[PDB]
Structures are given as C-alpha cells and as structure tokens.
Write an enzyme that holds these catalytic residues in place. Structure first.
Site: not given
Ligand SMILES: CCCc1sc(-c2ccc(OC)c(OCC(C)(C)O)c2)nc1CSc1nc(N)cc(N)n1
Ligand SMILES: CCCc1sc(-c2ccc(OC)c(OCC(C)(C)O)c2)nc1CSc1nc(N)cc(N)n1
Ligand SMILES: O=c1ccn([C@@H]2O[C@H](COP(=O)(O)OP(=O)(O)O)[C@@H](O)[C@H]2O)c(=O)[nH]1
Ligand SMILES: O=c1ccn([C@@H]2O[C@H](COP(=O)(O)OP(=O)(O)O)[C@@H](O)[C@H]2O)c(=O)[nH]1
Lengths: 231, 230
Positions: B34, B98
């Site tokens: 991914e 994914r």
């Molecule tokens: C594992 C690295 C990717 C990240 S980083 C992240 C994130 C990071 C910090 C955050 O708070 C400051 C955060 O908060 C989300 C929320 C609490 C729902 O506002 C999300 N979420 C994610 C998952 S979103 C995502 N979208 C994709 N399309 C693919 C994938 N592997 N992940």
C-alpha cells in the site's frame, strides 16, 4: 477527425461571448463551456462547484488545491462528454474548448502557487495528479490549435462589472494583471515552460478583443476560418 | 486472467507481514504494497512523506488532500503491477495491500463522519472516486477479498512493536472506529457501495490475533482453498 481548439484569455476577456457567437455559424462547430463559469450562475457537481467556488472566494489559501483539482476533473469529464457525444456525422467537425487543462495548470494553478495559496506539496501533488489524470483518461484531448483572445486588464475589469456577478466585484486589477502576464508569457512571448512536448509545436492564433465585437465580429471570424485551414 | 485479491484490515493488524509471507510461497504470487505504508527518494515519496505528517498534525486541514493522493498513488501502483508482473504464470495471483474501496469506505468515510472533512470535500472526493474507478471498466476489479481480523488492543500492541515515531500517538480510540467499519463492510456485508459487482465479491475472513509468523500454515491453507473456489 474532430479538431480541438482551445479558447484562452483573462477573466472577462469575452471567451464565452466569442464561443456563443462561433457555435451558431456552423452546424459543424460545437463548444465545451468551462465548468467554473457554470458554477458562477443544479446537479451535485453544480452543487459541489458553487460551494467550493464560494469557499475559494472566502479563503483561497485553504481551498485552492481542492478547487483546482475539482475544476480540472470537471473540465476533463465535460470535454469527454461533448467529444464522444456530439458532432456525430458533421463533415468538418471542430469543437471549441472554453479554456483547457493547460490553463488549469500553467496559468491558474501555477499562479495560485506563486501567490502562496498552495504550498509546494500541494502544487507538486497537483502536478502529479494532472500529469496522470490527463495521461489516463485525457489522451483524446490533445489540442490542434489555440486561439488566444488578448485583452487589457482594464477592459476585463470593466467587463466584470458589465456582467454584474456580485461574487466577482472584489476581484482586483493587480490579480487581472498577473494572469494577463501568465497568458502573455505562455501564448504570445512563449517563455512559459510545460511538461507537454507538443504544446511547443501547436498553432496559436492571437485576437484583440479590446474593442467590442457583439455586433461587429466578422473580421474575428475570418481570422478563425483562415487559422483552421492551416490545420 | 491475473486474479486480484485485496488483503483488508486495521492498522498494524498484520497485513504487510502476511502479504510478504504469501509472496514467498508461489512464483505465481505477487504483492502490491500500500502506498501510505511506504510513506510511513521518488517524487511520490517526498509528497507522500510530507502529506502524512501534515495529516498527523492537522487532520481537518489535510484529510481531503491525503485521501485523494493516497488513492491516486494506489490506483497507479496497482495499474502498473497488472502491467509488468505475472505475464509468465499459469495460476497468477495479485494480492493488493488494501483496496480503492478500502480507501473510501473505511478511511475517507471515517474522516468525514469524524468531521475532518466537511460535506463538500466528501461529495467531491466521492464524485472523483466514482468517476475514475468507473472509467476502468473491469481492470482493477477484485476477484475476492481477504480480511485479517484483529482487535484494537492487538493492533495497539503491534503499533508499539512496529515502532515508527508518529504512529506511537495513535489512541486506542481511533483503532476502535476503524474496527467497527471493517465489520459492517466485510462481515455482516451491510455497506451499500456504488460498485455493483462488489456485492458479488466473495470474502475470506481470517482470525489473526494469534502471532502467526511461525504458524501461518493453517491460514495459508484457507487462502488456497478460497483461491481454488474463486
Ligand atoms: C496510518 C497512516 C495514515 C493515517 S494518519 C491518521 C491520523 C493521524 C492523526 C490524527 O489526529 C491528529 C488523526 O485523527 C483522525 C480523527 C480523530 C478521526 O480526526 C488521524 N489517520 C490515518 C489513517 S487514514 C488512511 N487512509 C487511507 N486511504 C489509507 C490508510 N492506510 N490510512
Ligand atoms: C474567476 C472565478 C474563479 C476564481 S476565484 C479566484 C480568487 C478569488 C479570491 C481570491 O482572493 C480573495 C483569489 O486570490 C488568489 C490570490 C490572491 C492570487 O492568492 C482568487 N480566482 C479564480 C480563478 S482560479 C481558476 N482556476 C481554474 N482552473 C479555472 C478557473 N476558471 N479559475
Ligand atoms: O464585445 C464584448 C465582449 C464582452 N462583453 C461583456 O464582457 C463580459 C465578459 O465577457 P464573458 O463573460 O464572455 O468573458 P469570459 O470570462 O467568458 O472571457 C460579459 O459581461 C460580456 O457581455 C461585451 O459586452 N462585449
Ligand atoms: O503475527 C504478527 C504479525 C505482525 N507482527 C508485528 O507487528 C507489526 C505490525 O505488523 P504489519 O506491519 O504487518 O501490519 P499492517 O499495518 O501491514 O497491518 C510488525 O512489526 C510485525 O513484525 C507480529 O509480531 N506478529
């Protein structure tokens, strides 16, 4: 078989005016309006565009990347919608694009980068998304010529007022001036670099729309037909 | 005639470990890791590196930009693999870490429901997702889905085990929203998606909470059983 021509020039140069003229002068000529303008006037893209145009007005530094990707996407979709779907048996079909994916990038998106409304990661992500978006689905969109409608920032600002778009009254002279220079540089002086080789060789026609043409357009039309025959 | 199987699951649930294990077993088996995993020095990697960090610092500013680029970088990584790998196989299988449906109905749907994308950004994202993923006709379309099912605490452990600086902030809470959605999509097969054939995509669920780096044989026997019915 379908020759594709891009009409280009500043906000309120008179592009829509010129194409509304041109399309009536032959059953063989059709035109693809720029979606941004349809948004300044209702499906979900209509719905999405109004909102993101209104957002882009309110806070350009926040919304430029999102607006730019969505304007280009909408334009690419629509150039296909007209292109696979119109002028079907016409003998000498020409489709006239109201601006192009090239003005999306090398004029408007680039200028948003240069005035700091997108950062280098936004710009660079956009440049990657553009390259690829156009390569995948955008190939039948190679341009056969461009018609540059050249007009002063002053006319343009005057013409903005004549249209009366309340949303548009605050657009200032110096913004019209920098786009003017982005256009002059790409289509007249030809300083502007691009990552599309063939944009070097593609025929360009330049027309002065400084003077009104709504009831006096025959010379403009002659320059078009003449230009078309070189293609 | 290349088979396309997505490997679905939560963060650090064991997708990348498992996928590496399957790649080792058959010369007919290849992997598409991914994009965001790799961001987690190409032109994609600089952008990818930057936007991931900007996402970690301020999600409701960068969610839309992130989702758009994550999905693009995936579509092009997947498109490319059909186009090199597996020309010389009798039983070719492409395992994707994914999918595009994953991108949109797990992650993008979650960020919007958690107010990190507003309505416009969510309908623009979906418009684009719908328009493009439906230009490709039948090309990246999955033959089936494999779901590595863990719990959130399981996933938390493994996030600490895995040890990348910026993930060390992920609160158990996030993983919980991310789990509920994998269930409604894959298990109960609730979710209504815009993609017709996907309702006729068969699914293999694997319970993956037991450390499986030494004892994957049973899991892999099921993958084989599933690929043969497929
Ligand atoms: C594992 C690295 C990717 C990240 S980083 C992240 C994130 C990071 C910090 C955050 O708070 C400051 C955060 O908060 C989300 C929320 C609490 C729902 O506002 C999300 N979420 C994610 C998952 S979103 C995502 N979208 C994709 N399309 C693919 C994938 N592997 N992940
Ligand atoms: C003419 C209506 C569309 C708008 S609105 C706009 C705009 C609006 C407000 C702004 O600040 C208050 C603004 O400032 C931009 C800047 C000051 C250079 O950062 C630009 N620029 C534009 C042009 S950007 C653009 N990109 C396209 N790809 C297509 C298209 N028709 N327009
Ligand atoms: O010869 C002209 C050319 C343009 N316009 C007006 O100038 C404005 C800008 O033209 P248009 O909206 O077609 O410009 P575009 O932005 O589409 O180039 C509009 O109010 C037109 O009616 C005009 O009155 N006479
Ligand atoms: O059964 C397992 C599977 C994974 N891991 C470790 O847990 C971390 C997360 O795994 P992975 O990178 O596969 O997760 P993904 O994010 O791809 O789902 C890695 O350090 C693995 O070495 C483990 O200890 N036991």
């Amino acid at each position: 078989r379908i020759k594709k021509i891009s009409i280009e020039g500043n906000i309120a140069a008179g592009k829509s005016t010129f194409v509304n003229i041109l399309k009536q002068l032959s059953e063989d000529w059709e035109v693809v309006p720029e979606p941004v303008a349809r948004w300044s006037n209702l499906t979900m893209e209509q719905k999405n565009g109004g909102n993101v145009l209104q957002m882009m007005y309110e806070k350009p530094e926040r919304w430029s990347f999102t607006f730019q990707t969505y304007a280009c996407l909408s334009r690419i979709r629509a150039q296909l919608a007209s292109l696979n779907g119109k002028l079907k048996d016409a003998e000498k079909p020409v489709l006239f694009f109201e601006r192009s994916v090239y003005s999306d990038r090398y004029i408007f998106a680039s200028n948003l980068y240069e005035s700091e409304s997108m950062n280098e990661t936004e710009w660079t992500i956009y440049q990657d998304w553009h390259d690829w978006m156009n390569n995948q689905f955008g190939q039948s969109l190679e341009l056969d010529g461009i018609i540059y409608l050249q007009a002063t920032p002053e006319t343009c600002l005057h013409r903005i007022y004549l249209r009366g778009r309340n949303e548009e009254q605050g657009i200032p002279l110096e913004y019209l001036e920098k786009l003017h220079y982005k256009h002059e540089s790409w289509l007249l002086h030809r300083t502007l670099k691009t990552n599309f080789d063939y944009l070097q060789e593609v025929p360009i026609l330049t027309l002065d729309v400084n003077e009104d043409f709504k009831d006096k357009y025959e010379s403009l039309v002659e320059k078009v037909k003449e230009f078309l025959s070189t293609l």
